[PDB]
Structures are given as C-alpha cells and as structure tokens.
C-alpha cells in the first residue's frame, strides 16, 4: 500500500511547497508594510550599491523600484524607479531617477491627471549634507500622470539626474548604500 503512503507523502510535499511560497510572500508583504509612508514623502534605502550597480551594467537588473508610498491613508499610490547605470540619454553615464504613479485602491476618488509637485533627490550622507535634488510639476498631458489602468504608469523623471562620476566620487554613497528621497506635495489637495 506504499502507493497510498506515497500518495499522501506526495500531497503533503506539494502543500509544504505552497506553504513556503506563502510564507516568503508574507516576509515581502511585511517589509513593504513595515516601510509604508502616508505623508507623501519617501525615503528609499538602497543597500549593496557596488554589487547592484554591476548588475545594472551587466544587465541582470537595469532598474530598481521602491516600496510604495502614499499621499495619505487613502490617497495616491506611488513609488520610485532608479537606474544605477542610467537610462535614456544618461545610460552608462548617469544614475537615472524617476517617479511612478501606481494603481491605487482609491483612484476612483482621486483627481486626475495627477498634478502634485514631485521632488526627486539623492541624499548626501556627507557632513555637509548637500543633497542633490530636482522638482517639477507633472505635465497634464503625460500618460504618466493619467488615471492608472495597469499596476503602474510610465515613469517620469530625470535620465540625467547625476553623473555616475560625480556620484561615486562624492559623499552620497556610504557603507555601500545610498538614500533616495522623493517628496510629493500634498498641500494642493483640498481635503482628500
């Protein structure tokens, strides 16, 4: 009857596999949850700069995106996308940094297109704290600030945020880690 024993064993094994995926998926979920921000500001910590940058060049991982952050408990859902080895006109020469609108559970109640002012910036871990950054007001005609249809809209930002040379030779990187900060203006919003 080992067939029966074996069948049962087989079933259990499949279950344990599912369980392992279920579990891992939750570790991820916890992580995202543990780093959520609802005031429209994001502080994204990227560890392993060297290794990651290399994965960029090689092309194993051209970009990285942050956990999601919000303008409020029930507001716009957004995240950041970075390219360690550059994108577009800055590929191979710059670090590209973009803003991303994601499909939020409450999009139906939020104003569109997205018109909140976004401020992209790379923090200087140096004692002078001369953080690099740039702000812009969404272009009302860009399909990037359109009411989401897919999980996330087309990212918008600066392909040439910083020269890779400037970066690596400045005091922005420290302990093989960098910090990206995004600031979305929420004042504009009347009383969402």
């Amino acid at each position: 009857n080992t067939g029966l024993l074996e069948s049962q064993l087989s079933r259990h094994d499949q279950m344990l596999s599912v369980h392992d995926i279920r579990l891992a998926d939750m570790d991820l979920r916890f992580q995202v949850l543990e780093t959520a921000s609802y005031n429209g500001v994001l502080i994204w910590k990227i560890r392993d700069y060297k290794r990651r940058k290399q994965e960029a060049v090689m092309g194993k991982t051209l970009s990285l995106y942050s956990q999601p952050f919000y303008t409020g408990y029930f507001g716009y859902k957004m995240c950041a996308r970075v390219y360690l080895n550059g994108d577009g006109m800055g590929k191979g020469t710059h670090l590209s940094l973009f803003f991303v609108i994601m499909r939020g559970e409450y999009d139906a109640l939020l104003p569109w297109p997205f018109k909140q002012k976004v401020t992209l910036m790379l923090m200087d871990q140096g004692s002078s704290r001369r953080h690099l950054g740039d702000a812009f007001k969404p272009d009302p005609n860009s399909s990037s600030f359109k009411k989401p249809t897919g999980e996330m809209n087309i990212a918008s930002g600066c392909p040439v945020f910083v020269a890779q040379t400037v970066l690596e030779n400045g005091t922005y990187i420290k302990d093989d880690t960098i910090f990206i900060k995004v600031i979305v203006d929420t004042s504009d919003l009347p009383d969402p």
Binding site: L28, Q31, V32, T35, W44, K45, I46, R47, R52, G59, K60, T61, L62, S63, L64, Y65, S66, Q67, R81, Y83, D87, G88, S96, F98, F99, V118, A135, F136, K137, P138, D139, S142, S144, F145, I154, A155, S156, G157, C158, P159
Partner: peptide, 17 residues
C-alpha cells in the same frame, strides 16, 4: 520642471529593507 519619460527597459527588481 518637465518630467522626462523613462525607457521601460525591464530587468527591474523591488529593493527595500
């Protein structure tokens, strides 16, 4: 002050921790 569309090159990866 004008957003510049990014190339959805792919090879993306969620990284936060």
């Amino acid at each position: 002050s004008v957003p510049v569309p990014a190339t959805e090159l792919g090879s993306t990866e969620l990284v936060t921790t």
